[PDB]
Design a protein around this ligand. Structure first.
Ligand SMILES: CC(C)(COP(=O)(O)OP(=O)(O)OC[C@H]1O[C@@H](n2cnc3c(N)ncnc32)[C@H](O)[C@@H]1OP(=O)(O)O)[C@@H](O)C(=O)NCCC(=O)NCCS
Lengths: 308, 393
């Protein structure tokens, strides 16, 4: 089933990336940035511009041709909303192992159709849409997150937010713990990867010794993750989990920026997510400024620091 | 976005959904002629505003009530004369009320049975779902709590479409029987196709019911739309009535800024919605009352910071501003100079607390400290929240 593709989330120094929407404004800017970070960006697609060159790299008309000529195992999508679902489906049909869709604004109905296809295959793992991407610090960065604030380390981070994730990254770098893998699953209600998908990877990754889960109002993924942690993060070799849930002060029935951040029909509030996670052993940081210090203290309790 | 009763009722009717026959009038004479054209035995006149509580509202003409029933078209015109052009005040409007430019003149239908029927995308099953209950005419959340055995769901496959078997089963669980079950099933099918055609996030019919004369009717409905689909729903979004929105939110939307007003006095804005919510929260955790949510979006663009200040320096309840920009690669000295530029040109009069993260932060803080303006820098988000809270009485 589609869950078999979870391992594709763990990008590494061998991941080769093509950019869908390569020649556009943001595809160009973040491709330039990726090449400076040393990212193995090997080409990109723009329909009708195959055979051209861009940033010294080949441009292709299709994902299929780009993949055959470059050997790419991942794609990142900077395609405008009207066409981005088609871009995702193209990558799925081409069996790209990992697809990261940055695009914000895809119609929800488009994404329901995309998920229909996604869930009936397992060659391709989708992160997003409306997300910042994934980063294995020092090995592979796919997306728009600032690489310089990350430091390879032992906290796995999964988040529905963009810049709020960088706050958690900054704090865990500052306290000296660093990050094993950071996954921005994005702010849309219908997407390709949830918290559980990443938690499974984190719990089975020896380099991941603790976890930060960043969530917010809307949906039930945080509550689902709490149940998963009750069942699978309870035996010996459990891992400390810290969380922050945005939107304690959010009014009901309003979209709080992200398409998926809304309290509807009395469901989706932050308080209930905080209590669910607490009941699963998660240390919920009430303040977003204290994610690093909270997880550090959990390492201290378990004598997981070098001075022990 | 928001639709008047007559706009959603027309959208429904134009797509085969059965609603009460109606016309819209913007003069008293048009209301009289519309009432004649209904050729109905009982007529309902309803002022068109978005706020609730029309039935018990009062017009500044002195007329009590925004919903009136009569058999006489002449009475429809006379009452409409005392509605149109006047302001209607209800328990859910500001004290000035809402100007009424249009009234609906519709056939008044009796309701023999009431049920609840809604269509939305199921965030846990990844497809459209029908949500129905035979317990109609009440808040569905209450029904779920009191009687969860009376909530029925049918998951629909986006590519298969709704099946007759699904429509019939829901109709039966809603309590329709005999030919009215077949009618209700057909109406459910039409509502499902409507939901997909218009990129709704929800189509909620309450009451979905029957008349004594044996017709299945959607008596009242609420439609929520996916903002992401505006580019392929221009005609529907052109109907968006913004006249009852908070004015600052309307001004914000003009510039692709997502502003949500709150009941507080410490304003804030941030690049990123998660962090924007988190900034509101941390103000609250440290003893303050956030005045708004404001997400500048991605990329720290000086124009977005400028417009953000333009929005907030307008609101008289703002007593302080917390700016939180986690800019990664952008040069914070450029952002800092843009902030002082905006504060001078827009005449900032309230204490400002700025948390900048990114490159060149030290010079950025120097710029803010030397600007001669009431600006304080913060070393992290907790420091910023405490400073903001302490800047107000
Ligand atoms: C996706 C997004 C970045 C695109 O904006 P943009 O780069 O300014 O847009 P452009 O029009 O310049 O570029 C898009 C390109 O994709 C190309 N394109 C269109 N359909 C395509 C397809 N199916 N496959 C590949 N490329 C395609 C277009 O041709 C265009 O390139 P061109 O001008 O060389 O022909 C923008 O819509 C967006 O979503 N921005 C916000 C992202 C965000 O904040 N995400 C959340 C992060 S947490």
């Amino acid at each position: 089933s589609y869950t078999a593709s979870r391992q594709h989330l763990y990008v590494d120094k061998n991941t080769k990336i093509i950019c869908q929407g390569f020649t556009g404004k943001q595809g160009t800017f973040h491709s330039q940035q990726a090449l400076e970070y040393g990212t193995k960006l090997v080409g990109g697609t723009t329909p009708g511009k195959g055979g051209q060159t861009h940033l010294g790299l080949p441009v292709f008309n299709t994902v299929k041709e780009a993949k055959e000529q470059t050997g790419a195992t991942a794609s990142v999508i900077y395609v405008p909303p009207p066409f981005a679902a088609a871009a995702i489906n193209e990558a799925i049909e081409a069996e790209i192992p990992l697809v990261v869709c940055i695009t914000q604004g895809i119609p929800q109905q488009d994404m329901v159709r995309v998920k229909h296809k996604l869930l009936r295959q397992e060659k391709t793992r989708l992160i997003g849409p409306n997300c910042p991407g994934v980063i294995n610090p020092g090995e592979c960065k796919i997306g728009i997150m600032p690489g310089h604030i990350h430091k390879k380390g032992r906290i796995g981070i999964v988040s529905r937010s963009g810049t709020l994730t960088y706050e958690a990254v900054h704090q865990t770098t500052q306290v000296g713990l660093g990050q094993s893998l950071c996954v921005g699953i994005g702010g849309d209600p219908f997407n390709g990867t949830d918290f559980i998908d990443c938690l499974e990877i984190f719990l089975n990754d020896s380099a991941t010794e603790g976890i930060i889960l960043i969530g917010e109002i809307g949906g039930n993924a945080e509550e689902n993750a709490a149940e998963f942690l009750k069942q699978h993060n309870s035996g010996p070799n459990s891992k400390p989990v810290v969380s922050f849930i945005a939107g304690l002060t959010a009014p009901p029935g309003r979209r709080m920026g992200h398409a998926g951040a809304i309290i509807a029909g009395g469901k989706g509030g932050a308080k209930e997510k905080i209590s669910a996670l607490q009941s699963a052993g998660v240390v919920v940081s009430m303040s977003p400024a204290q994610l690093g210090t909270t997880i550090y203290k959990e390492f201290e309790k378990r004598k997981m620091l070098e001075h022990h | 976005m928001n639709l008047q009763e007559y706009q959603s009722k027309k959208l429904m009717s134009d797509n085969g959904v059965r609603v009460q026959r109606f016309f819209v009038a913007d003069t008293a004479n048009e209301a009289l002629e519309a009432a004649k054209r209904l050729n109905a035995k009982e007529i309902v006149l309803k002022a068109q505003i978005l706020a609730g509580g029309r039935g018990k509202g009062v017009f500044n003409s002195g007329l009590k009530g925004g919903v009136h029933l009569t058999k006489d078209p002449n009475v429809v015109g006379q009452l409409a004369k005392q509605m149109i052009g006047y302001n209607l005040a209800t328990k859910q409007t500001p004290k000035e009320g809402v100007k009424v430019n249009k009234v609906m003149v519709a056939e008044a239908l009796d309701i023999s049975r009431e049920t609840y029927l809604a269509i939305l995308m199921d965030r846990s099953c990844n497809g459209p779902v029908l949500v129905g209950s035979p317990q109609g005419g009440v808040d569905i959340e209450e029904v779920a709590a009191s009687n969860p055995e009376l909530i029925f769901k049918e998951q629909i496959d986006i590519f298969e479409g709704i099946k007759d078997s699904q429509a019939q089963r829901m109709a039966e669980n809603l309590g329709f029987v005999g030919p009215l079950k077949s009618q209700a099933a057909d109406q459910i099918t039409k509502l499902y196709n409507l939901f997909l055609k218009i990129d709704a996030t929800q189509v909620e019919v309450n009451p979905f019911g029957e008349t004594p004369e044996g017709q299945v009717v959607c008596f009242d409905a609420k439609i929520n739309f996916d903002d992401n689909a505006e580019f392929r729903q221009k005609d529907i979004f052109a109907m968006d009535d913004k006249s009852e929105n908070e004015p600052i939110e309307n001004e914000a939307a003009k510039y692709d800024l997502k502003y949500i007003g709150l009941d507080g006095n410490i304003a804030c804005f941030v690049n990123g919605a998660g962090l924007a919510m988190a900034t509101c929260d941390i103000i609250f955790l440290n003893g303050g009352k956030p005045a708004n949510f404001l997400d500048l979006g991605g990329g720290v663009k000086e124009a977005q910071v400028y417009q953000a200040f333009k929005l907030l320096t307008a609101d008289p309840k703002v007593e302080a501003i917390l700016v939180n920009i986690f800019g990664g690669i952008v040069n914070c000295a450029i952002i800092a100079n843009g902030i002082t530029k905006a504060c001078r040109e827009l005449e900032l009069k309230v204490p400002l607390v700025v948390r900048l993260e990114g490159t060149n932060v030290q010079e950025a803080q120097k710029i803010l400290n030397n600007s001669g303006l009431p600006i304080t820098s913060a070393i992290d988000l907790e420091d910023a929240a405490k400073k903001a809270v302490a800047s107000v009485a």
